[PDB]
Structure 1
Amino acid sequence: LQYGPLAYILGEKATKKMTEKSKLITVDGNICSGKSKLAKEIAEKLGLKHFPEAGIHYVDSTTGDGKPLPVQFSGNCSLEKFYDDPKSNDGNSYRLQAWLYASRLLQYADALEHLLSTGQGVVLERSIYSDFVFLEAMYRQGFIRKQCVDHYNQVKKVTICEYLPPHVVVYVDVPVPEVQSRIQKKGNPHEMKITSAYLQDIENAYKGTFLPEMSEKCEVLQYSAWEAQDAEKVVEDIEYLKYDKGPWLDQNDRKLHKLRMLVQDKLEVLNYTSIPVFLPEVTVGAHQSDQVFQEFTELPGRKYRAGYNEDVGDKWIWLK
């Protein structure tokens, strides 16, 4: 039975599947802070599902054959271009940020759906709750306009309010001089053009707004670069948490049924990421969007609903 009211009526209630191990964990930090390695270790040790940080091609990974699509089907957002030309007149900076928030929103919906349908917890690397630190950093360096920030807050206002916050927020605290040291060592030509000022703004948003906010409602665990190598100590900290705050304590089968009905419908999840606000950075002219949409329909296995594409080997279409 595909999930719905009928499945819920017949005993598919969330509280059955969820244990004390059914926790949503998010790992945050500055660039090159080592959060990616820590997130995998936490997930391995606690037996949780790991979600690699949602990038420009996250949505492609969940649909079709799972492989990334060409760049015109993501709007030509480019993280590489952002470092090369953060003040480009083509609006790439905010178009990327708006796209990345939608990608994170989609991933958060996937993570909650996994948690609510299987009962197994998840580990995320950043989320829709911490995505704003990049936007604040962008605005303070003059890479995006104030109207872009106003647009971002509108979309966030009508989307984040639907979801529950993480059970545990893990923050890895690496100072900016060390981050710049790790960036140059990593040797990515585009990333090395990052300014410490941009990195300092990311940290200021994290410590000024993010951590204080999440402290009111989550379990916030902070580690330094050294303390983050001891994954076992991090996992020991997690297992000894009390979980005495947050709205996860108010949840019940009724409220989690409505939540699962939302996160499973991805078009409903992304509904307000396309509000008709005609900001130049994200507005696409009719001729271009029409042309790009026709190209998308021509991609393999994309003309029809999944399972109805004869060009990729689907069978029994005349009985489906």
Structure 2
Amino acid sequence: LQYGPLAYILGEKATKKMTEKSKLITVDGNICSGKSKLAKEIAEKLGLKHFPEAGIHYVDSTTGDGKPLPVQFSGNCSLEKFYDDPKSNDGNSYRLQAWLYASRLLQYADALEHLLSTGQGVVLERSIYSDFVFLEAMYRQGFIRKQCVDHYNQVKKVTICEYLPPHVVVYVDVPVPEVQSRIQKKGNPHEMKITSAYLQDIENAYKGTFLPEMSEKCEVLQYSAWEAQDAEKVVEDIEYLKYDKGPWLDQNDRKLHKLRMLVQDKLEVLNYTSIPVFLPEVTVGAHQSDQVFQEFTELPGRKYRAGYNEDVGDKWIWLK
């Protein structure tokens, strides 16, 4: 019984499956803050589902066979190109950013659909609430145009308003000199081209805008790099939270049913990420999009709705 009003009427109400362990946790930080490692330990210790940070190929991981697709089917967004040539005339910088916000929006919907359907909490690394720090850094460094920022805010305005914020926001605060040292040690040739000014912009946006905003409506825990090493103390901090803020206290079965109907319908989730605002960075001409869409339908198991693809082994198609 795929979830709907009928399933809701018959007793599939979110408050039944939810507990005081049903929480949405997001770990934030600058680049190379060990936030990935902290996020895994929190999930393991608290028995939550861990979501690796949503990258360029997150949506591929959730559809088809789950393996990544060729680049042209993500529009040719390259994080490596962003580092090598952040000011490329092709518009890769904002096109990557617009794609990544949509990837995070989809992931936030999956995480919320997991929380509401099973009751198990989730741990995310960054979210649609903190995606803007990279946009602010890009703009302040002159990588993207003012019009791109306006487009981003338009898309964020009509999308983020539908979703509840995280229960707990965890911030791992690492200074830019230490961030810059860990980057050079990580030995990724493109990442080492990152400059401290860009990194300082991310930090400023996090502390100037993100943390004050999330503090009003969420539980914010901030750890230095050293303190994040003590994951057990981090988990201990989380379990002693009062939770006396935000909209999660206003939710009831009727509102959570409306929320679940949204997050399960992924096209409804992504509706406004393609608003017809003709920004050159994200606009694709008819001939190209027609050609790429035709190639996409030729990929294995993509021509038809899932379960109706004989070319990947589906059977009983004439009774389905």
Same-fold status (TM-score > 0.5): yes
Distance in 1 separating the partners of 2:244 and 2:102: 30
1:142 CA displacement: 0.1
Distance in 1 separating the partners of 2:12 and 2:244: 26
Residue in structure 2 matched with residue 203 of structure 1 by the alignment: 203
Q: Percent same amino acid among aligned pairs?
A: 100
Distance in 2 separating the partners of 1:158 and 1:175: 34
1:212 CA displacement: 0.1
1:222 CA displacement: 0.2
1:313 CA displacement: 0.2
Distance in 2 separating the partners of 1:147 and 1:18: 42
Distance in 2 separating the partners of 1:39 and 1:165: 17
Provide TM-score, normalisation by structure 1. 1.00
Equivalent residue of 2:226, what SS? coil
1:168 CA displacement: 0.0
Equivalent residue of 1:120, what SS? coil
1:235 CA displacement: 0.2
Equivalent residue of 1:221, what SS? strand
Unpaired segments ≥5 residues, structure 1: none
Q: CA offsets per residue over residues 144-201 of structure 1, 9 Å max, x none?
A: 0000000000000000000000000000000000000000000000000000000000
1:13 CA displacement: 0.0
Residue in structure 2 matched with residue 179 of structure 1 by the alignment: 179
Equivalent residue of 1:236, what SS? helix
1:34 CA displacement: 0.4
1:307 CA displacement: 0.0
Provide TM-score, normalisation by structure 2. 1.00
1:92 CA displacement: 0.1
Distance in 2 separating the partners of 1:196 and 1:271: 36
Distance in 2 separating the partners of 1:141 and 1:92: 15
Q: CA offsets per residue over residues 71-109 of structure 1, 9 Å max, x none?
A: 000000000000000000000000000000000000000
Equivalent residue of 2:314, what SS? coil
Q: CA offsets per residue over residues 234-259 of structure 1, 9 Å max, x none?
A: 00000000000000000000000000
Equivalent residue of 2:155, what SS? helix
Distance in 2 separating the partners of 1:182 and 1:110: 31
Count, aligned residues: 320
Distance in 2 separating the partners of 1:313 and 1:52: 30
Distance in 1 separating the partners of 2:17 and 2:134: 36
Distance in 1 separating the partners of 2:272 and 2:203: 28
Distance in 2 separating the partners of 1:232 and 1:178: 23
